[PDB]
Amino acid sequence: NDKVRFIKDELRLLQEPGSYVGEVIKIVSDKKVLVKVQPEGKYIVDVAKDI
Amino acid sequence: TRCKLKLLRMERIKDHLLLEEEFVSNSEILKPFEKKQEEEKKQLEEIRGNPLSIGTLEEIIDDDHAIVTSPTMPDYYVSILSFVDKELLEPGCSVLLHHKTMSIVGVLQDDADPMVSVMKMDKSPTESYSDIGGLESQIQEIKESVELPLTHPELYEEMGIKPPKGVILYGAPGTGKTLLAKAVANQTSATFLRIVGSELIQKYLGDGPRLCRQIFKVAGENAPSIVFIDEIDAIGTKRYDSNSGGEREIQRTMLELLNQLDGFDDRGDVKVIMATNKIETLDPALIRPGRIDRKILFENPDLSTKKKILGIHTSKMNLSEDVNLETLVTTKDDLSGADIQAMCTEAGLLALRERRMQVTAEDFKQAKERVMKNKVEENLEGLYL
Numbered sequence: 001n002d003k004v005r006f007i008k009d010e011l012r013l014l015q016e017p018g019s020y021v022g023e024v025i026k027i028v029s030d031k032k033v034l035v036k037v038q039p040e041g042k043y044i045v046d047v048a049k050d051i
Numbered sequence: 052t053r054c055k056l057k058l059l060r061m062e063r064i065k066d067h068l069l070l071e072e073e074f075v076s077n078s079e080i081l082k083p084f085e086k087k088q089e090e091e092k093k094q095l096e097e098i099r100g101n102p103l104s105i106g107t108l109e110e111i112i113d114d115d116h117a118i119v120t121s122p123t124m125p126d127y128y129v130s131i132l133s134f135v136d137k138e139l140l141e142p143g144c145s146v147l148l149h150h151k152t153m154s155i156v157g158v159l160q161d162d163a164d165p166m167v168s169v170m171k172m173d174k175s176p177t178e179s180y181s182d183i184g185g186l187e188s189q190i191q192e193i194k195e196s197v198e199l200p201l202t203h204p205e206l207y208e209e210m211g212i213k214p215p216k217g218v219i220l221y222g223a224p225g226t227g228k229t230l231l232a233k234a235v236a237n238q239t240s241a242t243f244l245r246i247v248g249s250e251l252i253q254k255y256l257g258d259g260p261r262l263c264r265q266i267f268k269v270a271g272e273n274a275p276s277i278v279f280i281d282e283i284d285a286i287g288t289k290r291y292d293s294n295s296g297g298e299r300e301i302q303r304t305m306l307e308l309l310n311q312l313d314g315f316d317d318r319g320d321v322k323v324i325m326a327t328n329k330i331e332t333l334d335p336a337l338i339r340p341g342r343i344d345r346k347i348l349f350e351n352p353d354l355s356t357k358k359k360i361l362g363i364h365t366s367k368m369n370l371s372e373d374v375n376l377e378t379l380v381t382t383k384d385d386l387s388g389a390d391i392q393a394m395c396t397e398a399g400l401l402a403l404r405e406r407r408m409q410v411t412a413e414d415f416k417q418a419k420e421r422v423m424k425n426k427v428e429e430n431l432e433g434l435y436l
């Protein structure tokens with residue numbers, strides 16, 4: 001049941017918004033992290049509830 | 052118990068009452084509107100959105116607009132919104148940009164560099180005055196120059212003199228030029244920026260005037276400041292051949308160093324300490340009066356002054372009652388204060404190989420022999436008998 005339920009909704013999961021990889025430069029106290037994405041500028045941005 | 056009690060009684064009522072006063076005042080602010088204070092918080096988030104894109108402020112246009120350079124390359128004629136001030140933005144400052152329509156929404160950032168930390172120290176020296184074995188008067192000419200106008204500016208305005216700037220600590224090797232600089236660096240507790248003179252020649256050409264001017268910028272912010280320039284001799288004697296600008300380049304670094312030292316800047320209080328081994332090698336403009344007010348000289352210790360150097364250094368040591376401290380001074384003549392510190396260490400080291408904590412008269416004579424052979428003395432005195 002795990003196999004057939006999984007392949008079927010996996011298609012909607014492959015409508016991905018994408019991802020990026022950065023790296024933590026330093027934190028700030030508004031709960032925000034300065035990240036530098038690798039061939040791009042830095043972003044001051046908030047954490048989810050997953051970290 | 053009651054000493055704690057009077058402080059408890061003042062501190063509790065004043066502070067807790069104030070805490071209560073804030074709680075009521077958020078609410079009261081809410082009333083003419085319907086929720087002002089708790090909505091200013093929801094607005095700030097909303098205005099800024101997420102993400103905030105960092106840029107570098109390229110130039111500021113006076114009309115509440117700015118040209119910010121995102122490092123991704125399109126430049127933008129942005130507006131300047133709330134939670135920022137336009138004299139808190141200077142060209143070069145980092146700005147926090149609203150993603151949907153670019154706007155300067157702030158900069159709460161630390162904006163600290165590792166480039167400044169190189170200039171700075173993290174410190175608690177082992178060096179304190181009275182680790183100076185004699186030459187007491189010289190301490191109370193240096194302390195009159197560096198340390199004293201921070202303690203009292205009162206003396207210098209009462210007299211009506213301008214407080215002396217700049218010291219040059221020169222003499223021979225082993226007379227503790229670095230040892231004074233650090234003994235006073237501990238006491239003052241003013242931001243003690245350290246920079247060694249050799250780092251002021253680089254491997255590039257033209258980077259010289261740029262590096263030198265960055266020292267004094269850091270120094271200027273953190274006023275009052277000391278800038279200690281250790282062995283500014285090295286740049287005139289040794290050319291390293293790493294600089295493509297050559298002999299020409301080193302000369303130009305000198306010239307920016309002259310303006311940054313006094314000049315037209317009207318910067319903060321910056322005492323400058325300059326250790327050097329020869330003052331006949333440094334550029335005369337560099338050392339000239341009214342930018343280096345006081346020039347202290349050290350020359351070799353005396354028969355009695357060597358006794359002082361020895362007490363301060365043999366004190367840490369474990370000792371025997373066979374140790375005749377006095378015969379180590381009479382045997383040793385025309386040797387530095389550096390040699391006496393190396394002589395205690397060398398005795399202890401022979402004593403660490405024999406596997407005992409005692410330091411005997413024999414480990415001292417053994418050590419005294421070996422340090423005297425290694426010094427190869429002067430040919431300065433080979434003229435003379």
Ligand SMILES: Nc1ncnc2c1ncn2[C@@H]1O[C@H](COP(=O)(O)OP(=O)(O)OP(=O)(O)O)[C@@H](O)[C@H]1O
Pocket residue numbers: 182183184185186223224225226227228229230231326328352360387388389390392
């Ligand atoms: N007059 C002095 N009294 C006490 N200790 C001294 C004195 N002279 C030298 N010393 C000792 O010797 C050490 C080495 O000398 P230091 O490095 O301070 O010398 P310097 O004159 O700046 O020499 P160079 O330019 O050759 O480095 C000091 O850390 C201190 O322990």
Ligand SMILES: [Mg+2]
Pocket residue numbers: 228229281282326
């Ligand atoms: Mg030195």
